[PDB]
Point group: D2
Chain length 188, copies 4
């Protein structure tokens, strides 16, 4: 299976560079103190097994899984739902990649209960031969959404429970709105 | 402060080592692939400013701030409260260090609402002199408690000044219930 | 002095980024599994101390310290001198920055015998406040040159000033070193 | 297959941990106001291919490869040959592992020209199952040795005249090392 691992080399690289780039955004507020809209950033390559599986599901020819948009992904975590908008601004203003696609599951959460902002970028990768472009999916979401989705994604490992899970999601969504509301201590 | 810097180097070394060690557990659960009892591992050394400040408001003579327990600290993050217990039992079993204090604020949350399991270890550090020991506070919490704690902590960090506080209190309670509901949903899927 | 670390934020950032970008070049050879022209890659942000010194020397006003070429630097270590050309061409082809200066102290060694290939680049750091370009110096060396340069530098960190019997020579050291590389290149040549 | 991926997990972990432990040693000198005996530190685990070919060469029966001493290896580089003694002491004085073997190829340098000090330690990895011990081979060398060792290791790709030029290249490096420390001595007298 060296075949695919050789294929994923530029995806690994793309992710590592984007980790350093985005993890450093936060670092900019670190010497003006303030409040940073970014709490932390994670990154990952879809494991080969998952890549072939999803390509069948959405019926993609092995010759064109490049068009699969989340072989490489990064995840940005914020405190408040209004930070997501701010982070959006940045990623759009950036010109070391270019935004290609977007899916707002914060406005219209999924039937599962799932909430996140997904923006797919086109990352220009420098290689020994020339210049490749790989699709990276960045996912922006609050800690609350991240709490919900991390547990739900795991359960991967019954209809009564799909419902309780959807209930839990919105419970969590209210706890979001409540902290943002609480943030009205700005009255100082 | 070049003097301070020499004081904090062992603590930084201690965070870095434990960081790598504890991500060993996560790393290991990726193979034998069930859900890892550790989601994230972070670590920080207290900034000199906060070291002096925490010192002031607890007496602690500036020649005895080695007794301050959280100069070095790691935070461990778990999906489930069940996962915390596993992580707790792993730490007590380790030979690379020694537990010397624990404060269970999951059982009895603080007045502010804060929940977390706090474990204090004595970490041995090889040096150029001989062998140094340092106190490192390991904090364990769920994604849900981590959500509350991060947000409440930041708000407090702007000075800290009423009815807001009681809403924060209830907020912790909501999160606890979300935690409980997810545990129930878990054993429900056993079936 | 808290002004300095805020000043240096974009410098470490840029260094961190080129570090990951360059190590990736190496990585593109553990799969190809042939010879990689890059063995190691390091980076530094000049200490405030060194920055201040270098400012007076080069005659750089402190409010335009930005014009200093190596506040941020990276260093790439190669096996053979020929590897240095392969990396030079690679760097010149990259479009995530642009080359603005080069100094070939390999062909024309410095007085004290220091050898290396320096190229200075203009790096496009994205930030919240828009963009920003930083001058980053990339040094390129063989292991052999690296050996000499490291040691000489550590010595030159004794009062700066230094005897002329230790000055009987490290150039001779450096010429010896230069000949080792010469030899190693030749030896390699024997492939048959 | 995956029975290997599982085998190497304690080795990759022990490497990651020692990497952090040893890199930290130089950091003790960033405010020591002295010179650090460690310049840098590298780490690797042996890729399965390499592991197999070695055991099917040194004639090691598979079912006990965990006797093979360098499945996990770190490597310490120094400026001077005097540093190597110093680091060596530290390593011996450490309590987070025990030294169990040693090969001084600086003292007695191998037909090829190979010079470096090899230290073998038993590392007590805390695992979930308990406490595993794993053999890790630490290699200490000067930059000079490293320049030579690195190039020669890669020439993996033979003429008896070439083997000899290489031998003399090792010597050349060794002298240049000695000249360096010599130069270093004269510097101290000032
Ligand atoms: N502030 C904050 N950070 C969190 C939190 N949870 C996780 N992190 C961090 O997540 C990081 C990176 O994501 P991780 O998924 O845990 O994976 P990593 O093992 O760090 O691999 P990666 O670095 O991304 O290749 C961090 O540090 P770095 O990678 O930057 O360095 P450091 O790792 O030294 O802490 C974090 O501090 C959190 O609740 N709050
Ligand atoms: N070891 C060694 N290095 C040398 C020698 N000559 C020049 N260099 C270095 O070159 C560096 C970077 O490029 P420049 O100094 O700008 O190149 P030059 O234009 O030739 O120097 P110049 O501007 O004329 O003084 C160094 O880093 P810095 O010292 O500035 O910062 P650090 O110690 O952090 O590495 C050097 O130490 C030498 O004889 N021996
Ligand atoms: N967000 C939040 N965090 C809390 C709360 N209560 C305690 N913690 C934390 O507990 C810490 C460790 O304290 P412990 O010594 O384990 O227990 P305590 O006795 O309750 O603290 P104490 O000794 O009284 O100060 C922290 O680090 P430090 O603040 O000291 O340093 P940092 O800013 O790095 O987080 C906390 O922020 C709380 O009500 N909300
Ligand atoms: N460049 C170079 N390196 C040498 C030479 N001789 C030995 N070494 C190395 O020594 C290694 C480990 O040391 P030991 O096994 O303890 O010493 P020995 O008993 O002499 O080797 P042996 O057991 O006979 O094979 C290596 O790793 P491995 O090769 O096994 O794998 P890799 O380089 O990928 O790590 C070496 O390459 C040499 O003549 N030139
Ligand atoms: N926890 C959770 N995550 C969800 C849910 N719905 C979608 N996501 C995720 O969305 C992913 C990628 O986003 P998109 O492809 O842009 O959005 P969609 O088109 O809706 O996905 P889709 O085509 O339906 O699969 C994920 O990574 P992958 O699963 O593909 O791989 P991994 O989790 O390992 O990263 C998700 O897990 C959900 O209901 N719960
Ligand atoms: N301080 C110093 N470092 C040197 C010198 N020559 C080479 N190095 C190296 O410095 C490295 C980095 O040191 P680190 O402490 O690991 O810091 P980093 O730059 O962030 O690397 P890191 O990624 O953390 O390992 C190397 O990475 P690796 O490829 O080994 O691992 P690696 O691939 O891991 O880089 C080196 O080979 C020198 O004269 N002085």
């Amino acid at each position: 299976d060296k075949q695919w691992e050789r294929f994923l080399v530029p995806y690994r690289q793309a992710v590592e560079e984007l980790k350093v780039k985005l993890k450093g955004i936060r670092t900019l507020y670190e010497y003006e103190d303030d409040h940073s809209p970014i709490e932390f950033v994670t990154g990952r390559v879809k494991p080969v097994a998952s890549i072939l599986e999803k390509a069948r599901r959405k019926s993609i020819p092995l010759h064109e899984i490049e068009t699969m948009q989340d072989i490489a992904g990064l995840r940005i975590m914020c405190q408040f739902v209004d930070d997501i908008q701010i982070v959006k601004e940045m990623l759009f203003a950036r010109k070391d990649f270019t935004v290609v696609d977007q899916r707002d599951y914060i406005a219209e959460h999924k039937e599962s209960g799932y909430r996140s902002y997904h923006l797919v970028v086109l990352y220009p990768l420098q290689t020994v031969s020339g210049e490749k472009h790989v699709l990276v999916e960045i996912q922006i979401r609050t800690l609350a959404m991240n709490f919900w989705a991390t547990i739900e994604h795991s359960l991967y490992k019954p209809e009564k429970v799909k419902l309780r899970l959807q209930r839990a999601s919105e419970a969590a969504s209210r706890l979001d709105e409540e902290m943002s509301e609480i943030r009205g201590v700005q009255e100082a």
